[PDB]
UniProtKB/Swiss-Prot annotation:
Annotated source species: Saccharomyces cerevisiae (strain ATCC 204508 / S288c) (Baker's yeast)
GO cellular component terms given for this protein: cytoplasm; nucleus
Keywords carried by this UniProt record: Acetylation, Cytoplasm, Nucleus, Pyridoxal phosphate
Gene3D superfamilies for the chain: Alanine racemase
Record flagged with keyword Cytoplasm: yes
Modified residues (N6-(pyridoxal phosphate)lysine): K40
Subcellular localization: Cytoplasm; Nucleus
Note: Present with 4890 molecules/cell in log phase SD medium.
Function: Pyridoxal 5'-phosphate (PLP)-binding protein, which may be involved in intracellular homeostatic regulation of pyridoxal 5'-phosphate (PLP), the active form of vitamin B6.
Protein name per its UniProtKB record: Pyridoxal phosphate homeostasis protein
Any GO MF annotation of the entry: pyridoxal phosphate binding
Listed HAMAP family: PLP_homeostasis
Pfam families named in the record: Ala_racemase_N (PF01168)
């Protein structure tokens, strides 16, 4: 049956979502890109609209909010967890079967906890794709790595034979408030050179996604421009 929704809202949200997709695509041609639809704090009905339209990759920031939404909505959604990740919440997150991606690995202890919890609670699911989150701000932020030695230790773990239930996909930055995107591109260059990787970048939100695309992102993460 699905979550019931208003048709004027349906028409409006579909229109906004298509308008963004068209711009992502036109920027990408002048230079696919993943358009991650960020639905954090938006109602399950709004997700249902876009799901019915054909969208599958949705980004959420709060652990309990994601777990409940995942139960309410179809199981072939690919959820991305893109908010603050606490070591003591990896077990709850690793229980969601269709947890497709976590983009906020910012410590070795978190990577290790997530791998272990996933081995424990959903061994038979596809490994969670992970981005390592970097503080590109050159200031001091609550989240994101900045020390080269500690970033390399995290990548090293992900490439080890022990890291079986999560898989290194890329790097992620929320940036700052484009030199942030240039510094994540430089981190990709160093990491790729040292370890043999070819990391995907996740950078670009509603205010700055056009620049992100222009500087080589593989994924932009858009909330406000779509759900408006
Ligand atoms: C909220 C959020 C987004 C979307 O931000 P908008 O300005 O609404 O497009 C993208 N990435 C992360 C990590 C976020 O928390």
């Amino acid at each position: 049956t699905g979550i019931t929704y208003d048709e004027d809202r349906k028409t409006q949200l579909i229109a906004q979502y298509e308008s963004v997709r068209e711009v992502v695509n036109a920027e990408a041609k002048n230079v696919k890109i993943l358009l991650l639809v960020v639905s954090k704090l938006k109602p399950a009905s709004d997700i249902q609209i876009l799901y019915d339209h054909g969208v599958r990759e949705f980004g959420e920031n709060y652990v309990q909010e994601l777990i409940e939404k995942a139960k309410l909505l179809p199981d072939d959604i690919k959820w991305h967890f893109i908010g603050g990740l606490q070591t003591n919440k990896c077990k709850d997150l690793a229980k969601v079967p269709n947890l497709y991606s976590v983009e906020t690995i910012d410590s070795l202890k978190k990577a290790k906890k997530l791998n272990e919890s996933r081995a424990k609670f959903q061994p038979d699911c596809n490994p969670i794709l992970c981005n390592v989150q970097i503080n590109t701000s050159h200031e001091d932020q609550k989240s994101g790595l900045n020390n080269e030695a500690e970033i390399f230790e995290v990548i090293d773990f992900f490439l080890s034979e022990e890291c079986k239930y999560i898989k290194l996909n890329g790097l992620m930055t929320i940036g700052s408030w484009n030199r942030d995107f240039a510094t994540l591109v430089e981190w990709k260059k160093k990491i790729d050179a040292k370890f043999g990787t070819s990391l995907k970048l996740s950078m670009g939100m509603s205010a700055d996604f056009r620049e992100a695309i222009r500087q080589g992102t593989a994924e932009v993460r858009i909330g406000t421009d779509i759900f408006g």
